[PDB]
Design a binder for this molecule. Structure first.
Ligand SMILES: [Zn+2]
Ligand SMILES: [Zn+2]
Lengths: 376, 376
């Protein structure tokens, strides 16, 4: 029998860690990359294809799921795992970020009321409502509901949102604990806030550790600050969180962002980049991203990446993917997307192996030299 | 205003002719190749794609259409042109060949009763019933109903089927003439029979010319006799038919069959070969057919054929079509099929142009030397 949630660290190198999260629906290898999940339709990669890229867990966007088809409908269909055809762990976000970035009728300490950008209907989110919707979705890792502060934020607005987020973190904790079916079978992560300000980040860390969570996310980054500033904030923010629990950097990111974040102690990542790039004709490679529409690929018989061992690179040449993309054939975008997600998983595997072997610092330096030289 | 049916010969070279058939729905350039038509679904090439290969007319199989979805249903949907999304001329066969080769309850001078190889239901064909079904389909060129004699045939069975076919030809003529809507707007072809026997072929020709048709088909070939014997029979059979009317060789054939048949006076052809080959990974080229699954094409950046100007060859390499076919992707079979039909139309255009210029005899010799050398 596997446990509800058990994080184990197998090896360390400086701030970097590798290990596993054991949950009832499966084992997650860390550092982990979560692809953003979709309904199982003909428009998206099949779930068996996503699993075969190496993904151990996928992410569901609560905001989009509550607009279409709705959380009650997903519960009636058997839950998010049945809906997505994915029987391994699923992490759901709280919905709060998309409320700021996509939807907004009322805002107060109680919660938020907002209008669907689809059909204008009114919806409500709060710590209690978010946790309940994530219960209806049946997700394995639940994110606490917080308040996002746009970039850039004044020190006053950053302090105010961080303090509200910590009161909302306690409310998410109590809501999660109130449902025995959820509390016995899922896990709950809290989210550190405080923008670029060290004292606010420390205030937030202390409040979260006092409440107590299964994992801790670093929020408020990857919203336009640039990598240098993001790394500077990670430098002091990650050591503030409890060492024996997973650290999750939400919405990051490009491959070099991930490598540097793992160097700073992050264990978990999610990003739409591999899928967005795949649909726009961009492939990630060890030599940097390439635009497959470029004429120089029209006669290039090599795979997208010379070392990738994804199913696409064992079979398909740059020239043929170039031909499919230039013709507008959906197969072209599917192959690009599969390779990009698999490339991210291969990046995580090399990170994990190099930490295990105590050579991650060298891997990161070798990785950057080659990725930025762009000898593709 | 275009006429019901006007065949005009623009140029001759020996027995070969080139010209046009003008009909109400369009002009047919001769010698002509008719691809075998299908319902407009996602499984088959779109009708606009078939037209863009150069096809002026397509063939409908009466036997298959009367089994599914049935001729009355096709009439209710607006006729075969609406059903196939094809607004240019359509030739329909009589159904009689598929009765022998695919279905058979009763046979007599009256007609035939047979069982659907699909659902076992009973159907009836006769000169009168065939012409009526082809009227319900709304086709532009109607084939007379005859009796096929299997290969090889004894002289006695060949004489008996030929004589019945000529009595059935008269009955088809009278049935076609009995419907003003059909007789004013469509054309009727009779079919010469007589197997390999010169005296029976002459008997058949005389009977058909006495009845009088808009066009004359040479039946009973391409059923296993081999090309040498087929050419030998064409040598004496085609001159027996009226010179100022089109000559149609049913079910032929391979590119070299077509060239040699045009040398012997044939104006019209149909064959499932380009489509069957396309779905089985075989492409026709000026250097003979190629099997695109062969490993030697996996890195071959040239198009299927070096001189073909079809839409596929302007864009797609052998290597990429090889990759699609080996992966089982329907796009691969579609591209092969489009190229094969377009290659046949380009063969007909080169035949027409070379006859016009009085160099067809040399084209045929050059064609055979290169096609059979197979330097692909
Ligand atoms: Zn790959
Ligand atoms: Zn071609």
């Amino acid at each position: 029998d596997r446990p509800r949630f058990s994080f184990s660290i197998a090896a360390r190198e400086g701030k970097a860690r590798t290990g596993t999260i054991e949950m009832k629906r499966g084992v997650i290898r860390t550092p982990a990359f979560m692809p953003v999940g979709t309904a199982a339709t003909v428009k998206a990669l099949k779930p068996e294809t996503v699993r075969a890229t190496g993904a151990d867990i996928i992410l569901g966007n609560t905001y989009h799921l509550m607009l279409r088809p709705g959380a009650e409908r997903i519960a009636k269909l058997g839950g998010l795992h049945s809906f997505m055809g994915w029987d391994r762990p699923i992490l759901t976000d709280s919905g709060g970020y998309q409320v700021m970035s996509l939807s907004l009728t009322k805002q107060s300490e109680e919660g938020v009321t907002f209008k669907s950008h689809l059909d204008g209907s009114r919806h409500m989110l709060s710590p209690e409502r978010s946790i309940e919707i994530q219960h209806l979705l049946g997700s394995d890792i639940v994110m606490a509901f917080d308040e996002s502060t746009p970039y850039p934020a004044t020190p006053s607005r950053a302090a105010s949102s961080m303090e509200r987020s910590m009161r909302w973190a306690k409310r998410s904790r109590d809501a999660f604990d109130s449902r025995k079916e959820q509390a016995e079978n899922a896990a709950l992560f809290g989210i550190q806030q405080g923008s670029v300000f060290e004292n606010l980040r420390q205030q937030s860390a202390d409040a979260l550790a006092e409440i107590g969570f299964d994992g801790y996310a670093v929020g408020g980054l990857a919203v336009g600050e640039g990598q240098d500033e993001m790394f500077r904030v990670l430098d002091f923010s990650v050591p503030m969180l409890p060492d024996d629990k997973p650290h999750y950097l939400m919405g990051v990111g490009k491959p070099d962002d991930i490598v540097g974040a793992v160097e700073r102690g992050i264990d978990m990542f999610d990003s739409v980049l591999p899928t967005r790039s795949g649909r726009n004709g961009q492939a990630f490679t060890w030599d940097g991203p390439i635009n497959i529409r470029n004429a120089r690929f029209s006669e290039d018989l090599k795979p997208l990446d010379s070392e990738c061992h994804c199913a696409v690179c064992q079979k398909w040449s740059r020239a043929c993917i170039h031909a499919l993309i230039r013709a507008g054939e959906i197969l072209g975008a599917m192959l690009m997307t599969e390779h990009n997600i698999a490339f991210y998983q291969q990046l995580m595997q090399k990170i994990r192996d190099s930490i295990s072997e105590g050579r991650f610092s060298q891997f990161a330096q070798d990785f950057r030299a080659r990725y930025f030289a762009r000898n593709s």
